Amino acid sequence: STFEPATDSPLPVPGVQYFLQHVQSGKYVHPHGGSDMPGNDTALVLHHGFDEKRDALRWVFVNDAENKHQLKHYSSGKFVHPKGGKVGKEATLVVHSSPGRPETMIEMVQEDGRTYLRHTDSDYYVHPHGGSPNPGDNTRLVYYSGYRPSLAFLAIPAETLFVDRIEIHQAQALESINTITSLSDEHRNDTDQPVQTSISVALEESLQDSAQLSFERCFGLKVGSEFEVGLPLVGKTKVSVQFSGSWKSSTIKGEVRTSAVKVQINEHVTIPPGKCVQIRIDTRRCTKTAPATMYLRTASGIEVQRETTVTSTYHYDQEVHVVPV
Numbered sequence: 001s002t003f004e005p006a007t008d009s010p011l012p013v014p015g016v017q018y019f020l021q022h023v024q025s026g027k028y029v030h031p032h033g034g035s036d037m038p039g040n041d042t043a044l045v046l047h048h049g050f051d052e053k054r055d056a057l058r059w060v061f062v063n064d065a066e067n068k069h070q071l072k073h074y075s076s077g078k079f080v081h082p083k084g085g086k087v088g089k090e091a092t093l094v095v096h097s098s099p100g101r102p103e104t105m106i107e108m109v110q111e112d113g114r115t116y117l118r119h120t121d122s123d124y125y126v127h128p129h130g131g132s133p134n135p136g137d138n139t140r141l142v143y144y145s146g147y148r149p150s151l152a153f154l155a156i157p158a159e160t161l162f163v164d165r166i167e168i169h170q171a172q173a174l175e176s177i178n179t180i181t182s183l184s185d186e187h188r189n190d191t192d193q194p195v196q197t198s199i200s201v202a203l204e205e206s207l208q209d210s211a212q213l214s215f216e217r218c219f220g221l222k223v224g225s226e227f228e229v230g231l232p233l234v235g236k237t238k239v240s241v242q243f244s245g246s247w248k249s250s251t252i253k254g255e256v257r258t259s260a261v262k263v264q265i266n267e268h269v270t271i272p273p274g275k276c277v278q279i280r281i282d283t284r285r286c287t288k289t290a291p292a293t294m295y296l297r298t299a300s301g302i303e304v305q306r307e308t309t310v311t312s313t314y315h316y317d318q319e320v321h322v323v324p325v
């Protein structure tokens with residue numbers, strides 16, 4: 001299915017760079033005038049303009065002991081304040097070189113399946129001035145009571161992270177074992193002497209290993225085209241998995257490069273006269289689900305975290321028997 005920004009918008013991770021997009025208009029959040037160093041009391045506006053290389057369009061959510069629920073302009077380090085210093089009806093959002101306070105708190109929230117910018121501990125949300133679902137370029141953003149779907153924002157990741165590790169939460173780590181039983185053709189010796197007979201089985205489709213990372217909305221982070229992580233696909237022993245997807249994916253597919261079992265079976269069986277045999281392959285499959293924490297690093301080595309669900313199918317043991325028919 002196609003990425004649907006209204007149902008799939010991720011909640012931003014604090015300390016990571018984001019672009020902010022007004023979903024209904026597709027316009028981005030800019031400082032008015034587009035400077036990398038906006039002046040104090042410069043309004044936040046919506047503008048169709050977009051360039052991934054423009055640091056002036058990057059925003060960072062902050063939530064720490066010194067800055068509780070605040071929003072920072074990346075290129076300037078200025079915070080997003082209500083003009084005049086307290087949230088109220090039609091208070092313009094501005095950048096200002098001063099720390100946030102309780103009466104300036106701003107965060108992205110999920111309400112009825114969409115993400116909005118909200119003044120924490122209030123019913124004031126971020127609206128375009130005039131309330132249009134399709135505001136004109138340079139329309140200022142304001143605080144106003146209540147929300148409606150046309151006010152939704154999408155936080156688009158604006159930097160590339162490294163996936164350092166994924167740690168499974170074993171308290172909810174569930175393994176189901178299933179035997180996959182595969183039979184060759186019947187081979188009969190219709191001669192009057194014992195015959196050594198070549199019997200082959202192809203199991204590629206049956207014994208496909210896989211792993212997936214799943215998210216309720218979407219991964220929401222950029223980590224490059226592929227990344228490798230060790231995952232405990234059966235018991236505690238880590239297996240190398242290569243994942244590839246996009247920040248927009250709700251399921252990131254992983255490849256297991258090293259198979260633990262055989263997918264081509266070639267047996268040489270002595271069949272007595274008049275007798276018929278088959279090769280029987282029994283392959284143990286571990287289907288595993290576990291909540292997990294992804295640990296990612298910024299280029300400067302700041303650690304952030306993302307919850308996921310790890311699902312995997314792994315064929316880990318195999319037996320081959322000659323069975324009579």
Ligand SMILES: CC(=O)N[C@@H]1[C@@H](O)[C@@H](O)[C@@H](CO)O[C@@H]1O
Nearest residue numbers: 030031032033034045047049138
């Ligand atoms: C070319 C250029 O930087 N133009 C910018 C535009 O992209 C947008 O940021 C706007 C916000 O008020 O300020 C300027 O017009």
Ligand SMILES: CC(=O)N[C@@H]1[C@@H](O)[C@@H](O)[C@@H](CO)O[C@@H]1O
Nearest residue numbers: 041081082083084085094096098
């Ligand atoms: C000291 C003080 O409260 N200053 C605030 C500043 O932090 C910011 O909120 C600004 C927005 O217009 O309003 C005032 O100047």
Ligand SMILES: CC(=O)N[C@@H]1[C@@H](O)[C@@H](O)[C@@H](CO)O[C@@H]1O
Nearest residue numbers: 090127128129130131132142144
């Ligand atoms: C009825 C209506 O759409 N009213 C809107 C209001 O909800 C809010 O968006 C405001 C922001 O300036 O613009 C208009 O007044």
Ligand SMILES: [Cl-]
Nearest residue numbers: 148149150151
């Ligand atoms: Cl609406």
